[PDB]
Amino acid sequence: EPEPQMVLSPLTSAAIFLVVTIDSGGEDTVRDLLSDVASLERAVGFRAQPDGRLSCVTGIGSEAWDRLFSGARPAGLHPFRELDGPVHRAVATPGDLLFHIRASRLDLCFALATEIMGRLRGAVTPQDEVHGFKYFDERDMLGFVAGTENPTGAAARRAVLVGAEDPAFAGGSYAVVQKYLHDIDAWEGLSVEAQERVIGRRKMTDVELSDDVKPADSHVALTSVTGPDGSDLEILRDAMPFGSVGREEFGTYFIGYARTPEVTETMLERMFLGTASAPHDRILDFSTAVTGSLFFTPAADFLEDL
Amino acid sequence: EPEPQMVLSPLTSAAIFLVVTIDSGGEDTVRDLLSDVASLERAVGFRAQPDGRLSCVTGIGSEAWDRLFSGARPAGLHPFRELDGPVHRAVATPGDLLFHIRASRLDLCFALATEIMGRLRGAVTPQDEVHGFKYFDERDMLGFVAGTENPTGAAARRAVLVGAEDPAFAGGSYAVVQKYLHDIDAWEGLSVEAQERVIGRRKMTDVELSDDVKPADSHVALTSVTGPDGSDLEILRDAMPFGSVGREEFGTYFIGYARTPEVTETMLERMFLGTASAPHDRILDFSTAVTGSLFFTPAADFLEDL
Amino acid sequence: EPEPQMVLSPLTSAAIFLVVTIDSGGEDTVRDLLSDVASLERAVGFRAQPDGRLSCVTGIGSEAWDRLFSGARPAGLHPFRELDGPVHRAVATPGDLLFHIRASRLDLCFALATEIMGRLRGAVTPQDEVHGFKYFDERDMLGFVAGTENPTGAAARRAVLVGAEDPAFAGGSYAVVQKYLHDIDAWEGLSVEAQERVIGRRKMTDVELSDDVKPADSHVALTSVTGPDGSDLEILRDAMPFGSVGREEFGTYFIGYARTPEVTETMLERMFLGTASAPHDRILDFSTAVTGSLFFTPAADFLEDL
Amino acid sequence: EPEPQMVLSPLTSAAIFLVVTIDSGGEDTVRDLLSDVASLERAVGFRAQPDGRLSCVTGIGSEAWDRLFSGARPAGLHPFRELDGPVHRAVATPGDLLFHIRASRLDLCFALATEIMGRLRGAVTPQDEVHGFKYFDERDMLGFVAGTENPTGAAARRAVLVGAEDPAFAGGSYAVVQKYLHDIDAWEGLSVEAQERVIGRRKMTDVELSDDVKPADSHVALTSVTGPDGSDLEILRDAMPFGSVGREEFGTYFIGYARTPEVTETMLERMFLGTASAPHDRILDFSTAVTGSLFFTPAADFLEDL
Amino acid sequence: PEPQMVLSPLTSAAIFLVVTIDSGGEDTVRDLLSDVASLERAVGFRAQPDGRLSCVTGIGSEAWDRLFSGARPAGLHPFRELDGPVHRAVATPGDLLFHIRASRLDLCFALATEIMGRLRGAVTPQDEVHGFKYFDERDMLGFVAGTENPTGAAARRAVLVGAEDPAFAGGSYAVVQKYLHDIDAWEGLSVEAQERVIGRRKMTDVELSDDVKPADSHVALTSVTGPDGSDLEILRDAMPFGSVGREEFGTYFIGYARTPEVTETMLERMFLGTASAPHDRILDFSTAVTGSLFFTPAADFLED
Amino acid sequence: EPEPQMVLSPLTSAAIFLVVTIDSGGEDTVRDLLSDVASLERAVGFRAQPDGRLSCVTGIGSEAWDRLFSGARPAGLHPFRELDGPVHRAVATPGDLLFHIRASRLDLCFALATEIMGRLRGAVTPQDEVHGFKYFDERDMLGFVAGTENPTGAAARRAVLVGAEDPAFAGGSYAVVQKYLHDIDAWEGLSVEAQERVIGRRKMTDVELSDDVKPADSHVALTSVTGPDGSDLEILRDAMPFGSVGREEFGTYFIGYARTPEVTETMLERMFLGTASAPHDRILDFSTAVTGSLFFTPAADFLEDLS
Ligand code: HEM
Ligand code: HEM
Ligand code: HEM
Ligand code: HEM
Ligand SMILES: [Mg+2]
């Protein structure tokens, strides 16, 4: 088999997301760092095992792919598509390389980002840096448990990893990132029961609302999607709270992994464009997207053989 | 028996430092929050015990003291004094209120900061916000172990807490804060042995250099101070690394606690102004101060009664 | 000078409460066990240290005291007083001996209870046995954080331990126990905001309601009491959830420790008999008392002396 | 593949065993709960991961199966078979549904039991509820280590999961439960060496007795069984201590999982009816069975597609 | 005065180092003594809070007179040999003791390495033992070890020199003996017979009742009452050690007390017996091959 | 397919290495103990789960194999080959049985060793006994992080376990042991930068030196080897510090596992005999080998199905 990157990670309480663009002439410096990134992860993380749980997933954008590599393109790799809905917009922002860094502690994420950015100085321009923290009981910036219905084990592997549909790229995945800022004032003005109707779960106990009470425009209803077979279409998410209390900046950095970008893009269309029964996802009345990018995260042996 | 604030804390791997100025007319809102800050600490932290280890130490500046309170001033409270050395300068920057927030996780620091700044909205202007992280083996941004020679137990209590010398304020302490930015490139250009001559301890094993090889201008030599009786004068320090890899900002946020600011100010004079044997602390050839402020952290019962 | 029992314990996730009456002729068997109870605690607990945190607090009722001992009575020892309110009743039930057994695991509590009851077979009749468990985020059976405003450190010692006011019994405490069963159907019919008006704290974040919106008949308002000097009167509580899902028994086992029973009894009078502004504690509309007893927990050296 | 339920769980120190009958007319409410039980397990357990280790195994009895489902039946599903031995009896008691709930803390077990029974109120009658706790060194109520010779990994999967011998029910297992009470007075009247001859292993070190000293009527000799091919026949056991010190109730709740009930029933016949060499298992001279039931635990996809 | 870390948290690992001071080694020794506390902080700090590293430094009677002028601690004298009818407590040489404890052997070894590095060419090693506790606090005989140690203020009153010897307040006396066990003979006894040797139940660690506890059980003989009828207590941290290949199965005994009189009265009852007991039955399965006595000064004494 | 022994273990901070020779006539006692070693592991270890992480890997030497078992030999089992280099020697020392015992605590390793040796008394003679401890940040006796480039997961299983190339022994592995003593005085006389040119990685941060600076005779350059297709050949290491401060004994006990002894023996030839670019591994100028032995660690089912 090919060795995937650590897409399927254990639960982690800390993350750094780095998005960067490749300057004129930066290609060779980038290809060098890509062939070393797995060995840098071992160097920073190994001495802190078993508690550190440090990992890095590397993604490459559509335009960056053609600057870096000759030969085939992964069949689903394209630039993020903007959605201009009746009320809400999903923007596209620039990005060539993503580093999704996770661990039990921010300091280990920081030490790996420092070695990666040290090797790229003068080849890349930073577009975004986010220092994520999960709340001690797995809660998100809105006060709800985050991750409950993610797939696990073999269902997670089937949902996330490219297979025989695109054999040269088996063991890869597609990552969509969006930085959201929340209107926390408007959100905390709702009763808990009104917040539960926005999400589609109980806030304190995390039990799903039944199909007879769950509104059509609740976040859980709109991100539930069935294929032609009537099989559930799933993705793997690891969204992280972030912010600054001084600047009144309270955010969710969304990341979702899927075997094909079509599943994530169908969920975004239902959220932003609505359906027959729902104008839009109620969660977008409290959350504004300010970034949007799409990346292919190759199998680790692809990056190693550079 | 006055109750000190949690100046003497267990080791913590995460911190938020908040420094704000009090807007004109903000006095009443500030005095209200001060009388509730201990109950806010309990509310956010209690449900995360015993691993959270959340605490908040609240400091008040010299000029803020006069706007907030009638009656006595603590004997040692004055504005931070600028040091204009031949090569290096310790700047004085504005601050009325300090919140030193510590825990095992950044998310807990953030939830308490969020409730404090919620209560002060419209009454204060943010001057500094720093999210600190300690490395997993107690190392700082320069790669050295940080905290080793801090006093513990009764020696710590005698070094840090105001007593019979100023009985109205017994159980208070004085805090000095300074934000440093490092020249990491210049630092990593030194051999380990040359780094050890700058600090005055072995890098890997944390053993102090013997008095016959320790340079007079090493950091440990200059911050070792004896009183008139020939006793060691100690302070309690809890400096944290911080940074942004995107902006190439690699920093140490210094905080020192002492029973009287004279001990901390004598250390700063030796570091910046030098002695007969040393022009300046060699650590300042790799570290620039961009803030400097001084605060009195009163006994907890003082804040509770106002 | 006297050694208190482990009244001030570290947080524990498991407990057993054993209340027994002394059969006629049981006196000598009981006095023998009381002089050995500390050595049994060490025998069961030592091999699980330091994580086990096994402790047993032993209490003696007013009528039992007179059967067991000649000489002085603790000044405040009397039988629990029944409270006959217009709507709610605090019943008095028999109890000669209390064993308050706490640890990080149920199995350790059970092994010490097994040795204690082994020594007392044929000298005592069991009146109550409760196996308590804490929820993983310090929540009680109603879904609220329990323990938040307990006193700590020196304020805990001052609030709980008998001193110079009763010198022969210094290092003792008084314990009040009540078993409550909840109407969980009626409780879960309230909105979260209506539950918050019953307790007097926010449910998810545990922040106290501000003094102008906290109802006078909320639980927190009625159990806040000021002495003549204007000081807060405090007790130390370690209440535990318990239950059987099959019998629909959802309960709180209340225990409160105080230096004098007057403080605990003033809180119970406000809850059950009301004030000018509150007919009764709203928590009693969802909580029925089915036991009530009062015990003196002597200094450890008092039990050893026998 | 079919997905099995969590029959092969990690070690857990807490359990709840719930056995109910289905009331007349209750069928529809039960089939609803069965299709939701996995979603309830994720909802209660997710926020405690990865330490919580919460899992629920659902079993259905022979008579209940015929009330709930039409069509083909698991080949081995029948009501528990009573064993009337010369001295000892294995009773059959009523049970239609089993919930085997396991976690690292009792409170997590209790919260999932509460949500299961909340959905079944008015459709089922409780027959048995046991709160199990393991001793801190894996010991049982007799003072011996319990679980040592359980199969692990692939040998465990082969021992427990239905395969090609019953292809419509692949991924299922058969569970036998028995609640035992011990005569602890009679037991503790044996020497350690006499206790070792009852079990067939050393008490302090858990080393199996040599084939030259292991008695024919020791527990390990009688539950050791070889098939016609000379392979070991294994089951997976997760027996838990339970009891009440006040009632002098000291028990073991036995559960055994096997791919066919023939293996568990051959072990029970040797224990209760004896063999050529042994009248009965000596463990039954200190252990009385007061319940006995048999359940089929289907693959998880069976329960989901209801 | 600040005591050394005599009263430590429970630890699962220890190194015991006993050395003699070579002629001319005195100055090198006095230099290392004034730095041992800063070496403990250096090695241990970065491994907090799990490390639990401490070093207790002791000085023998003969070594005291070579190192220091002025007062002697009142109770400091050479370990006394006990020539009993059946069992012997030997006296073996020892000038300096380092009792190193932590959660992990590697931390003990790193501190030992820095101490012995500073003393190279000034000292000769007499004994080095790497100790390990079993996961349920059991010792080499299979019994729970440490159960009756005093705690808190009763421990401080039992262990630390006070007003009776004010120049040395905050010090303690340490007695060490290395024991080797006859494990074959021991495992030949029934559990019940082992319980009569110790005076405690093996599985549950409950003390035997006063009507069944033999007079020559280990717990009966090491129970000693003062004139007022109070228990005289010591603090013990004995550790298992061994080599499986050389069939060496041992207990390294260390006991701390405010005066050596308490520890020496217990050793006289064990080895010489009384009217009621020939000797401690534990000595029929345990041979002492070292014996030494040290004063562990207050930490401020080592600093000055 | 079959059950391997616990060759691929979780990280462990404590280990006991026991090497013994089988006395004449000891064969039957040895074969008895081999069929019980897995049940002895369960007995001592189960009650300490989940923290104990106790395991035992049992190895059999080439000459012991012939005395114990009458059928086929594993294809690669032979006595350790001595390497007589210009400067440095890798000696071959006697050993018939290896017990590689690992856990989170030394006491658990010691209790299993005690039960194993109890069953073997009078049938075997002890040749080596080492009580190993790892430093709290995975560092070795030289102060460098040890284990960093070990393979993990499926790459580890492919590197270590016998498969279709030798089907009767599938799920087995080959273990090489060497006890090294260090010259710590000579080592601590080097600058940190000079230590880094000996190893080939940075001491504080464990980052590999660039291909532009990494010397030909650094330890990392010489133990990197590519097969004919240009794939890396890998082994799995679990080397442990050991010592006695009194005797000035500071050591590393090396153990390496591989699917074929040819990978480990090629690395040892480059270290001790050198190449075109390097006379010898610079690590050997501060490390002397005092033992060397080779063992086959069979599949667990092989030990169990015995007599
Ligand atoms: C804008 C900020 C967002 C927040 C705060 C948020 C929050 C949540 C929460 C609380 C849940 C329920 C617990 C869980 O299953 O994790 C959830 C579920 C989910 N979210 Fe989001 N979400 C956000 C954005 C998105 C986006 C952008 C997507 C996909 C494009 C998405 C897809 C999902 C999916 C697929 C589920 C699982 C649905 C199910 O139960 O089947 N979410 N989210
Ligand atoms: C660049 C900013 C700073 C860095 C990176 C730094 C770093 C360190 C380090 C690595 C040590 C040795 C380990 C320890 O005992 O903590 C130390 C010691 C110390 N530092 Fe700093 N320091 C900084 C600024 C300051 C300032 C501004 C002062 C005082 C005004 C100070 C006071 C001390 C003192 C008192 C010691 C203890 C020395 C002793 O008695 O051994 N440091 N510092
Ligand atoms: C081979 C050497 C030794 C072994 C294996 C050993 C073992 C034990 C054990 C298992 C206990 C009972 C539980 C507890 O720790 O309280 C005990 C108690 C004790 N031992 Fe020892 N011991 C040894 C040597 C010594 C020596 C030489 C002394 C005194 C000089 C001593 C003094 C004590 C004392 C005072 C107690 C507590 C007595 C009490 O219950 O008041 N031990 N020992
Ligand atoms: C004194 C003995 C030794 C010491 C102190 C030592 C130390 C080291 C160190 C510190 C590393 C780097 C980090 C890592 O991957 O672990 C390493 C790597 C390595 N050592 Fe050793 N080692 C020793 C002996 C040996 C021997 C005898 C072999 C093989 C016969 C060996 C094979 C390796 C290999 C294959 C690597 C990984 C290199 C790579 O591909 O990056 N070592 N060793
Ligand atoms: Mg009975």
Author numbering:
A (entry chain E), B (entry chain B), C (entry chain C), D (entry chain A): 7 to 312
E (entry chain D): 8 to 311
F (entry chain F): 7 to 313
Question: What did the paper state?
Answer:
Using an X-ray free electron laser (XFEL), we have previously determined room-temperature (RT) serial femtosecond crystallography (SFX) structures of the ferric and Compound I redox states of DtpB,26 a B-type member of the dye-decolorizing peroxidase (DyP) family. Such an approach results in “pristine” DtpB structures that do not exhibit the effects of X-ray-generated radiation damage. The RT-SFX DtpB ferric and Compound I structures revealed that the distal heme pocket, which is composed of an Asp–Arg–Asn triad, was void of H2O molecules. DtpB, therefore, represents an exemplar of a His–heme-ligated peroxidase in which the distal heme pocket favors a dry site. By disrupting the distal heme pocket Asp–Asn–Arg triad in DtpB, our RT-SFX structures reveal that a wet site can be formed.
To assess whether disruption of the Asp–Arg–Asn triad in DtpB leads to a wet distal heme pocket, microcrystals of each variant in the Fe(III)–heme state were produced and subjected to RT-SFX crystallography using a high viscosity extruder sample delivery system at the SACLA XFEL beamline BL2 EH3. For all variants, well-defined electron density peaks were present in the distal heme pocket, consistent with the presence of resident H2O molecules. In the D152A/N245A variant, H2O molecules are in identical spatial positions to the D152A variant, indicating that in the absence of the Asp–Asn dyad. the preferred spatial arrangement of the resident H2O molecules is the space vacated by the Asp152 side chain. In the D152A, D152A/N245A, and R243 variants, w1 is positioned close enough to the heme–Fe(III) to be a bonding interaction (average Fe(III)–OH2 distances within the DtpB hexamer assembly of 2.52, 2.83, and 2.28 Å, respectively). For the N245A variant, k1H aligns with values for the wild type (WT) and the D152A variant, with the double variant being an order of magnitude lower. Notably, the pH dependence of the double variant shows that the rates measured are an order of magnitude less than the single variants while still retaining linear dependencies on [H2O2]. These results indicate that the on-rate for H2O2 binding to Fe(III)–heme is much lower in the double variant, but the bound H2O2 behaves the same as in the single variants. The H2O network is identical in the double and D152A variant structures, so the reason for this lower rate constant of H2O2 binding must be a consequence of removing (or disrupting) the Asp–Asn dyad.
